[PDB]
């Protein structure tokens, strides 16, 4: 994945230039000096793109070329088993409902409702993560 890491490297470079230029341009010429608000966001945007691109580059340096990344390749190159994809699940809607219960508790500041919503969130995330690993009931 050379092109993916290249995109994130380009974004990281531009964001680093933007952050440094903003810090220098507001350290002088701004009322309070360094704005301390846009500068932080731009620096950590550089951090975000840097993390993603650097990880992708570690992935791509030790990766042999995939069919997707190799022009003039055949469809038969991609034969075999792709990975695992969940056919169905009703756990996402319960996770969303639990998060909504917790959010309603925090909006109206009802601590009992926040606690119940977090308990429901933990239970539903347990259900989602455990869904395809529960073995047969042993009796």
């Amino acid at each position: 994945m050379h092109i993916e890491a290249r995109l994130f490297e380009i974004l990281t470079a531009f964001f680093a230039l933007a952050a440094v230029v903003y810090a220098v341009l507001t350290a002088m010429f701004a009322t309070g000096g360094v704005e301390w608000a846009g500068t932080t966001a731009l620096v950590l945007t550089t951090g975000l793109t840097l993390i993603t691109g650097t990880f992708f580059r570690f992935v791509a340096r030790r990766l042999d070329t995939r069919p997707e990344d190799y022009e003039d390749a055949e469809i038969s190159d991609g034969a075999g088993e792709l990975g695992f994809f969940a056919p169905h699940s009703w756990w996402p809607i319960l996770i969303s409902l639990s998060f909504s219960t917790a959010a309603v508790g925090a909006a109206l500041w009802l601590p009992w409702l926040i606690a119940a919503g977090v308990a429901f969130v933990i239970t539903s995330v347990c259900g989602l993560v455990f869904e395809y690993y529960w073995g047969p009931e042993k009796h």
Partner: protein, 551 residues
Amino acid sequence: LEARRPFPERMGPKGNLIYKLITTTDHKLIGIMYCVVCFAFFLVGGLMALFMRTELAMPGLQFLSNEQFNQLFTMHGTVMLLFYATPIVFGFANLVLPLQIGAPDVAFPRLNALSFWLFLFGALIAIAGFITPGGAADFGWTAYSPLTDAIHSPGAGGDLWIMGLAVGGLGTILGGVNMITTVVCMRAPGMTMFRMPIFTWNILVTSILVLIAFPILTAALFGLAADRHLGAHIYDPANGGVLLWQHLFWFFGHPEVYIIALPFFGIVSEIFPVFSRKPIFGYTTLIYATLAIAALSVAVWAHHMYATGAVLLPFFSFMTFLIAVPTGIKFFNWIGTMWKGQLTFETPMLFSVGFLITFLLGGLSGVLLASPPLDFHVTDSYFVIAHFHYVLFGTIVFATYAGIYFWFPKMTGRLLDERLGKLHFWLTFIGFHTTFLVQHWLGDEGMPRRYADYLPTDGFTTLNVISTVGAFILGVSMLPFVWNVFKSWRYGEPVTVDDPWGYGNSLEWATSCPPPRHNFTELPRIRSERPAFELHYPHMVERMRAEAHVG
């Protein structure tokens, strides 16, 4: 000879859909549900806008109070921007991105459904502020710092608004993660990154923009909730709290508008070649323009802040002009695409041209707004209202309708009616221009935005009447589209071929209408950006490789 049915099955039997709705992990069904729920929220927000315009028709306060009108513009802006536009972006992504790259599914199929349900329930939580006796939030969708305090606006509608926005933002971030991973590492064997369509590029970069923007909004909203429920002093004016909130919110908010702008650029870039019978002009140029727009969208926010007197004007002015340039590159590429084609103006093409005109005038108004001296006069007026309505309506309405008329045959197997499409388009176009072309003049004369009431000596009466007439024309224009969709889901003309538009591209026109589960019973050899076109017209391949370069 073969045996067929005199008419395909209109609807499934009892119990065909509800369990799928509850438990689906199919990106196609998730996209369908996104589109339906987003259009319903659009109807609600438009009803709010109709109430606003009806109040603003005459110089008195005929039926709304000040508080109700404030709640109306606040919740209407919120619903239109966050509960319709970004989710419809993800709905289009779910519909066609896995198809466009030759993939059977999204990367994390349960996370997709989680994102959809987080959307639905967060939107409902934020809207539920109307059920409260005090009413919903009434501090604008921007929610500036001291007015959103516990003292100013003490009701629970603001809190419900904040937390529903947080839940919807979590859903949006998860959707962006899913889309980027799917684009990165699930493409077809022939689909190199420089062979994916423009829509896939735009969705990828839009998801990156989501990942940058939405977490900052979540942090700011958590800070504001701590402020309101704990007396935190995070946004106290004695600190830099006012301008701190403005900085954080706009660092979110301008990336948000480009989040809701780029994918519809991609949609029209898909639609133009199909009805022009020629390739997309400047494919790599369009990719570079998208990348430049996304990069510049993160470091332009404080041009929404020229009036505070607390920001560096030259930096953001220059950055705003510089971000305006690549969008002009995009329009010239689209013109080149339409240039010297065989244009047949079927409904998606008609909405694409409506997009071109509308967003053109919106961009002109925007570069007018970029200049701080001019924004000094026109900020917080209806010139701003007309500007962003023109851009938001060119992008998220005209291009959304073009995408719906385009991919409805692919998602349903039935064709929407062309006569109803033309009627609805012309109604929408005339109504939009009628209701928004005079708010420029309104704002320039001195009518500020977010006013619930004016006076007959102000001079704001005739233009407000014209705008209310246009708003009711726009409300009326939704009847043909709803009727068309409702009738043509079941009794629409069947599609029994791939590519009901003939000259399609992007690999979703190389599979049935609708596509089967797992999206593909075969994949053609991908050698160019438009594999389906060279799959259906092989004799053109040589020509596409000989005539591609004008110079």
